Amino acid sequence: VCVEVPSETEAVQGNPMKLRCISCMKREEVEATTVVEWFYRPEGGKDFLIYEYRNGHQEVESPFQGRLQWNGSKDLQDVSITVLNVTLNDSGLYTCNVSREFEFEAHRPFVKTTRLIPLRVTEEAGEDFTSVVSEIMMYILLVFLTLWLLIEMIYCYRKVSK
């Protein structure tokens, strides 16, 4: 089962970050030969790669040597990559450029599907905006419901006792 979902663009200093990347085939009966490449770009960078899968995981010297991890699938249908101890400086553009080719005994289609990730780590990222407003909604609704119950209890007590 494959469902494409974008990666989180926010990381917190001192933790690990998962640069999710899901690129999956229209049909899952089909086999392919997948080539995966990850690129990184500082504001002054030139998009140099930091990882790649080609006939197996390769070793690619870069600033990221030694603190990069693989969290993909055997079928190379999820090519997510994890970074350790994200520091304040490392940020910007991460590129999951994936190209695969199929076999059909008559033709060999080629496809490339790019996926880019804007990463901005910060000193302390607080609770995301959506969750906080959702919690406020829950609290106001809970209070209003209990208030409505209290109001009608008082109302009906008055009416009954009279």
């Binding site: 089962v1 494959c2 469902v3 494409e4 979902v5 899901i22 999956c24 085939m25 229209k26 049909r27 899952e28 009966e29 089909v30 993909g72 699938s73 055997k74 079928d75 249908q77 999820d78 199929f102 059909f104 005994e105 008559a106 033709h107 060999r108 289609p109 496809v111 959506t130 969750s131 959702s134 919690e135 909604m137 829950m138 609704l141 809970l142 419901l145 209990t146 119950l149 009608e152 209890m153 009906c156 007590y157 009954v160 006792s161």
Partner: protein, 1111 residues
């Protein structure tokens, strides 16, 4: 012309005719002909026997001719229609045999007709055929109405699906058996499938692989027989859908080519045809049967014996596979002990009641037979083999029936109606035998001649009509449904023009006979003031409505928990908080009810206990999301929709009624369980351990038995070849596997696989060989006859009896409706039995030259109706491959009909001075006109995205719904629609309950069987990935449309093909496997529950029909 009733020749001929030796002689000769023409093969004496029989038949013709005369008008030779058949066949044979012509293959076919002579030689069968003809004449209107609706929905299907099954996935950018090639170089083919993969451009339609594009091109699937490209083949598809025959493949094909949103067509077709038209046929036939019937040492020690019998049944149930020596000798010694006990029983009873005394009663004979068989097995078992003697030990389970009051009364009913059941059974057997022989003579040469058309490797297939046994089996399968796959082969070898009539004859006449036998069996078996403040709050009508809204919302929010859950980021948070809100509301309700009523009153109510357990379920679900150890509690929330049961008065009446009708069926259900256990033990005996086979681990097909002669070859790798020795998914290794196999055989899903295994078994380690044990088919035919067909009559008769009883308990026709709905029922009964008698006054003075009369004339209405019918007829001429002239011709016909309906509407608007909008049907016609004009000339100027070419055609067709109106159509159609419109309330309630149960099971299945690898029954359209997919799967299961593929896929773990750790991208759930135990429980429970509710649906509609007809 005749001869004198006073003449020596006529007198002697009459003397011979009425002498019973004559009728017996002819009967015996007929049966000899039957055997030696059908069930026997390869004699050398054929000419002598054939000519002797021809002489006997000619003598019969001459005698009966002279005795009766020729054309006295009645009770003469030509008075009896059977004599026409006899004379025709006899003369044809006399001609062919002794004439230059050699219509030889044709001749033998004709001879098969003499099998039907068995009917006029038996007076019981003759009378039965007469009454059957009378009932068939009673079925005329229902047949016509079914034809009407099938034609209408064939038009609807062409409008929606024409050409779709030609969709393929074309490759873009740009030897063997000649009848089994695959154009893999141009279109995409799945690994194993024969036909190109269907695919569509909608997002809810089949998707192409990469480097492929979807273009309509090529041939239809199933050799061209499955398609909606023309009337006729659309009628074929809709008739296959009425019968619900192999429908799941058609569903998959249509929902691949087009979108999954078209499943409404199939749901509506099911409801209208498989449910309602079948209910009408059943009601007509049951009423006809009713009309015909109205026209016509001793004391208190037996506890020891009953315990001994029960323990013997337990010992029988314990034999399985594999088995050691200790657990085998244990069972041997048990057999010894029990047979000794029963021998002593027989001896002592013989002593006490002197010998004639013993055999005066019927149960003593059965017990003596038990002892006699047991001893003659104990001895003689070891030598010579004779393994079938053991197979009769299960007869001892029937001893348990001597103390069973229910088994006795059931057997009593059977025996008391035996006389009438005998004629029906004999007639059905005669028809099956004649049909098998007729089909063999018609199509056996064709099956052998064009064999390569229906089997790669050009060997005869598993189902055919080359010889008589397979002909008999084919007809028997046709009588169970299952007539579509073999019809394709028939037409491939013989042709459309010949197979379709024979198969229709079998289908229709077999259905009539089987339904009549079923009705006969059923009819045989029938014979602090704050406290009061809280009480005020809780009972208020608005509090109930608010809590009901909350229940509905809480239920519906469960449908969002599908594979796309992590993709919907904000919905996830909203739902997580709404769960707490719902919990709070329901806890407040519990506390308020506690305060109002008082714990004793609270827990003393059944429904409030259900509420309380729902509250516990909410709380447990909440606490589960704190520790991954406590995570498994979460799933409990899927019990939540049970709240819907306790909050709505409708669900409560439906559950009450289901309890009142279907609970008293416990004793009969126990009898049926005993029958199934007998058959399961038999099947374990016959088949246990024998379904093992050596297959190719990857390809999965059985190795040819000419190489892997047994297990030792398979297991022992000596030439480094891959080959795995493993069991079958559905086997008979113990009584539990037996029960699963037998359920799979009783619903006819996956039964071909099990019987294929059965008729291929040899020994316990020997490779199975193709159709080497062909007579085991007798096992499954007997099971279907005795542990499926007869139990069904038993159960249904009990349920009908409870229905009628509880109706009498109320003096009210309907029990599935609420009190508020009885007034609705009365109102509907008034409307569809009463004339509107509400005409309008004709404008006179404002505009004299104003002929109101024309519109209200009968002539105008009848011309309008004929126009509707012609519009419908002109639709049938459309096809997929069509000329350019025909296309424009049909376009202009539709345009002219739009024009003519517009003229109708305008003239009516003139006639009624603004009362036109008072009548609801007039609004329907007005909307039809407006939408038709819109669509017809919407692409004239606006040039919208597009107007589908068939949209205007379909819009115009809706007006034919006018044929079901009292004044504007045949009077029968209204009468045959009355039951639906009178049972609409109860049907609504039951359908809502069915939807609720389906919803619960869909949510549970979403939780369980998503992420299970896609295999036989799990594919793109039917799976448990979303709510719609799961509901499609459950609907498919409810009609028995292939639930065996679903379970076969869920059993992937049994088959050792799944990765318990594969990452599923975009979801935190890991794994690819299923739980077979959960799968079995799931499907068995759903099958039982859905069956019970649907059967009650049928009972409701049929009882309503009977009530209406009773007036």
């Amino acid at each position: 012309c005749t001869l004198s009733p006073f003449n020596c020749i006529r007198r002697t001929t009459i003397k011979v005719l009425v002498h019973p030796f004559f009728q017996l002689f002819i009967l015996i000769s007929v049966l000899i002909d039957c055997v030696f023409m059908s069930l026997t093969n390869l004699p050398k004496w054929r000419p002598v026997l054939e000519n002797t029989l021809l002489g006997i038949y000619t003598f019969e013709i001459l005698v009966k001719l002279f005795a009766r005369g020729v054309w006295a008008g009645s009770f003469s030779f030509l008075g009896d229609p059977w004599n026409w058949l006899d004379f025709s066949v006899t003369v044809f044979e006399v001609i062919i045999r002794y004439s230059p012509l050699d219509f030889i293959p044709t001749l033998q076919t004709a001879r098969t007709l003499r099998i039907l002579k068995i009917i006029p030689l038996n007076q019981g069968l003759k009378s039965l055929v007469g009454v059957l003809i009378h009932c068939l004449k009673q079925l005329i209107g229902v047949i016509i109405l079914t034809l009407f609706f099938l034609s209408i929905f064939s038009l609807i299907g062409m409008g929606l699906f024409m050409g779709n099954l030609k969709h393929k996935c074309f490759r873009w950018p740009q030897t063997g058996n000649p009848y089994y090639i695959r154009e893999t170089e141009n279109f995409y083919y799945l690994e194993g499938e024969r036909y190109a993969l269907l695919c569509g451009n909608r997002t809810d339609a089949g998707q192409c692989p990469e480097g492929y594009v979807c273009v309509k091109a090529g041939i239809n699937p199933d050799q061209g027989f499955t398609n909606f490209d023309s009337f006729g083949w659309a009628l074929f598809a809709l008739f296959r859908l009425m019968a619900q025959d192999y429908p799941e493949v058609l569903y998959h094909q249509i929902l691949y080519a087009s979108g999954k949103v078209y499943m409404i067509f199939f749901v509506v077709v099911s409801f209208l045809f498989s449910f309602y038209m079948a209910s009408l046929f059943l009601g007509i036939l049951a009423m006809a049967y009713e009309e015909e019937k109205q026209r016509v040492m001793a004391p208190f020690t037996d506890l020891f014996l009953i315990i001994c019998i029960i323990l013997n049944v337990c010992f029988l149930t314990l034999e399985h596979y594999p088995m050691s020596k200790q657990t085998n000798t244990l069972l041997n010694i048990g057999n010894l002990v029990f047979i000794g006990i029963f021998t002593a029983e027989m001896i002592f009873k013989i002593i006490a009641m002197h010998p004639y005394g013993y055999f005066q009663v019927g149960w003593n004979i059965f017990d003596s037979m038990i002892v006699f068989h047991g001893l003659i097995e104990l001895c003689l078992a070891n030598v010579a083999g004779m393994a079938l003697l053991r197979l009769f030990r299960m007869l001892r389970i029937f001893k348990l029936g001597k103390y069973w009051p229910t088994f006795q009364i059931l057997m009593w009913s059977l025996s008391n109606s035996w006389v009438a059941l005998k004629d029906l059974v004999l007639l059905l057997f005669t028809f099956i035998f004649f049909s098998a022989a007729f089909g063999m003579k018609l199509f056996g040469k064709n099956y052998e001649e064009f064999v390569c058309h229906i089997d790669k490797d050009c060997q005869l297939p598993r189902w055919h009509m080359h010889d008589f046994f397979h002909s008999f089996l084919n007809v028997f399968r046709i009588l169970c449904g299952e007539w579509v796959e073999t019809l394709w082969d028939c037409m491939e070898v013989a042709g459309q023009s010949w197979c379709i009539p024979f198969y229709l004859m079998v289908i229709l006449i077999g259905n009539l006979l089987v339904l009549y036998l079923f009705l006969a069996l059923v009819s045989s078996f029938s014979s602090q003031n704050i406290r009061k403040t809280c009480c005020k709050i809780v009972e208020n009508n608005w509090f109930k409505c608010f809590i009901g809204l909350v229940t509905l919302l809480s239920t519906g929010t469960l449908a969002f928990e599908d594979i796309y859950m992590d993709q919907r980021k904000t919905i996830k948070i909203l739902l997580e908080y709404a769960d707490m809100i719902f919990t709070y509301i329901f806890i407040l309700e519990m506390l308020l009810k506690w305060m109002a009523y008082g714990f004793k009153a609270y827990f003393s109510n059944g429904w409030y206990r259900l509420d309380f357990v729902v509250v516990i379920v909410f709380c447990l679900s909440l606490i589960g999301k704190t520790r991954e150890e406590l995570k498994p509690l979460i799933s409990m929330k899927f019990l939540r929709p049970l709240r819907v049961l306790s909050q709505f008065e409708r669900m409560k009446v439906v559950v009450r009624a289901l309890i009142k009708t279907t609970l008293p069926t416990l004793n009969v259900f126990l009898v049926c369980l005993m029958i199934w256990l007998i058959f399961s033990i038999m099947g374990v005996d016959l088949f246990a351990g024998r379904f093992y086979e050596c297959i190719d681990p990857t390809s999965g097909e059985r190795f040819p038995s000419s190489e892997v002669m047994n297990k030792s070859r398979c297991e022992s790798l000596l030439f480094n070849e891959s080959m795995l020795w493993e069991n079958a998914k559905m086997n008979f290794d113990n009584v539990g596997n037996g029960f699963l196999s037998l359920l799979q055989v009783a619903t006819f899903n996956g039964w071909i696989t099990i019987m294929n295994s059965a008729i291929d078994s040899v020994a316990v380690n020997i490779q199975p060989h193709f159709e080497v044990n062909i007579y085991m088919y007798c096992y499954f035919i007997n099971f279907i006859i005795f542990g499926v067909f007869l139990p069904l009559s038993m159960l249904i008769t009990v349920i009908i009896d409870n229905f009628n009883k509880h109706k009498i308990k109320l003096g009210g026709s309907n029990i599935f409706i609420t009190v508020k709905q009885r007034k609705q029922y009365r109102r509907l009964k008034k409307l569809m039995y009463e004339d509107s008698q509400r005409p309008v006054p004709r404008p006179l003075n404002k505009l004299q030259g104003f002929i109101f009369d024309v519109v209200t004339s009968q002539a105008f209405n009848v011309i309008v109706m004929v126009l509707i019918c012609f519009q419908a007829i002109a639709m049938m001429i459309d096809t997929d491959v069509q000329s350019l002239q025909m296309s424009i011709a049909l376009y202009w016909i539709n345009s002219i009909f739009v024009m003519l309906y517009t003229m109708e509407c305008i003239l009516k608007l003139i006639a009624f001075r603004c009362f036109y909008f008072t009548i609801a049907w007039n609004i329907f016609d007005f909307m039809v006109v407006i939408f038709s004009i819109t669509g017809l000339c919407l692409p004239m100027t606006v040039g919208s995205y597009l107007v589908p070419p068939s949209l205007v055609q379909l819009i115009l067709l809706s007006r034919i719904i006018h044929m079901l109106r009292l004044g504007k159509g045949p009077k029968v159609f209204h009468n045959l629609m009355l039951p639906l419109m009178l049972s609409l309330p109860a049907l609504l309630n039951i359908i809502l309950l069915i939807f609720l149960v389906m919803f619960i099971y869909a949510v549970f299945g979403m939780y369980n069987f998503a992420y299970v690898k896609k295999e036989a029954g799990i594919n793109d359209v039917s799976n448990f990935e979303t709510f719609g997919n799961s509901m499609l799967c459950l609907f498919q299961v409810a009609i028995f449309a292939g639930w065996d593929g679903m379970l076969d896929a869920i059993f992937n773990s049994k088959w050792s093909d799944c990765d318990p750790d594969k990452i599923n991208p975009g979801t935190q759930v890991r794994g690819d496997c299923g739980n077979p135990s959960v799968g079995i429980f799931y499907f068995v429970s759903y099958i039982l529950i859905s069956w019970l509710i649907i059967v009650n649906m049928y009972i409701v509609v049929v009882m309503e029909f009977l009530n209406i007809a009773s007036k």
